[PDB]
Design a protein around this ligand. Sequence first.
Ligand SMILES: Cc1c(S(=O)(=O)N2CCc3[nH]ncc3C2)cc(C(=O)NCc2c(F)ccc3occc23)n1C
Ligand SMILES: Nc1ncnc2c1ncn2[C@@H]1O[C@H](CSCC[C@H](N)C(=O)O)[C@@H](O)[C@H]1O
Ligand SMILES: [Zn+2]
Ligand SMILES: [Zn+2]
Ligand SMILES: [Zn+2]
Length: 422
Amino acid sequence: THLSVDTKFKTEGMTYRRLISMMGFYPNMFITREEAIRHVRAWIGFAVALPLQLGFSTGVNLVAVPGLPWNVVRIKIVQMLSDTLKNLSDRVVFVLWAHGFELTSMKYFVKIGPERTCCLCDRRATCFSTASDTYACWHHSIGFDYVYNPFMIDVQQWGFTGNLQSNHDLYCQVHGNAHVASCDAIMTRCLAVHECFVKRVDWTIEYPIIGDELKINAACRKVQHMVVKAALLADKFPVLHDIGNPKAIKCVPQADVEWKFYDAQPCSDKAYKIEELFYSYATHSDKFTDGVCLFWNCNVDRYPANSIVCRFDTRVLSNLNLPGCDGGSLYVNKHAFHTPAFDKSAFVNLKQLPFFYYSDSPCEVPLKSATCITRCNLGGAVCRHHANEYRLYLDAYNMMISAGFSLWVYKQFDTYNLWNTF
Ligand SMILES: Cc1c(S(=O)(=O)N2CCc3[nH]ncc3C2)cc(C(=O)NCc2c(F)ccc3occc23)n1C
Ligand SMILES: Nc1ncnc2c1ncn2[C@@H]1O[C@H](CSCC[C@H](N)C(=O)O)[C@@H](O)[C@H]1O
Ligand SMILES: [Zn+2]
Ligand SMILES: [Zn+2]
Ligand SMILES: [Zn+2]
């Protein structure tokens, strides 16, 4: 269920019931680690540095004075949160490294109470207007001055000796402490992301559809089938090493090849078919010498020369792609996939895969393309079926590239060998 307000609160930075009274006030504003993970799209780092500097993981800094007026500050906060979260989440989770002072400040821009709905839609209310005594979601908050029923978590309560700086810098070299509140907010959210996502994928947690997930995923799998099918025809590899496949599902089930599975974290139910292995170039550059390695979004330090690779570019701006640890990003599409920083040095043994369509299937505005590898294109004019399938494939390839995925292949790959298959 929820985080019982009885639960003790480690005071080195007492219970939650006590703490809420001290702060100046949905059984609890604080939620479990498990619930925070489910609502990762809602995470906003929050820190405070007598005029107060308010800092958020969006890099925004606001100063209020008893700076700027509180009535102006509280409007800017609702606007910023509404803008950041309206397409991501139905809520906000403030991510804290709790020093005491940030919890004190919430009374000035936060209101709590029972769960309520937007005056304009069926969505849960995230904002309140003192001026009109009305409740809004993130989409309908244009006037509004108070954050309504925000959730929060203190990362210190997960058992960290040392300060924020020392623990953040253990796993991340990308966020330097320029002595301001936003930098602490950024570092704190980074640390929480490290603790919750970097170690492994949680297959059991699924995230709602918020954009083009289904089309992106369908297109990626079409391209995966085409490319691995094509490579196996072209170079006739006796064995495929599928590195980072924890479910033991072949993308080409018909393929005449020995299909070997590996993963750092194989699913229990298929572990019998999958070798536990953590691939690093430094520890396996002399291994998997036979056949071809498939790294379908298996984001290792460096790929060996005999690879087929799909990799997501962490720099891509998308509602699916959240800021991550150490130049990486957290790609939330069905599940949450922490991705290491896109680094070109990883692809040094490979080349970019060129576009093509290949079909050995039976034949059935005329198409003139060297990239349509079909029986009919070999003989002058392309058949209506293969011309149609070509256009559907080009659509899928374009969907995959715009979604931020890139394709790499062993340097000796060529479509010449696919022309020979006819
Ligand atoms: C968006 C997505 C990807 S990804 O595009 O490869 N990726 C995102 C980018 C990224 N960054 N760091 C890791 C990843 C993985 C994989 C899956 C998935 O659910 N995979 C289960 C799965 C297997 F694990 C194995 C075979 C299988 O066939 C059919 C499903 C299946 N999803 C929903
Ligand atoms: N260095 C590494 N060596 C082996 N497996 C790794 C790895 N880094 C990540 N993984 C595994 O890579 C997978 C990425 S998600 C699943 C991707 C899979 N190829 C697909 O088509 O869906 C996870 O199962 C993860 O445990
Ligand atoms: Zn609304
Ligand atoms: Zn960081
Ligand atoms: Zn044809």
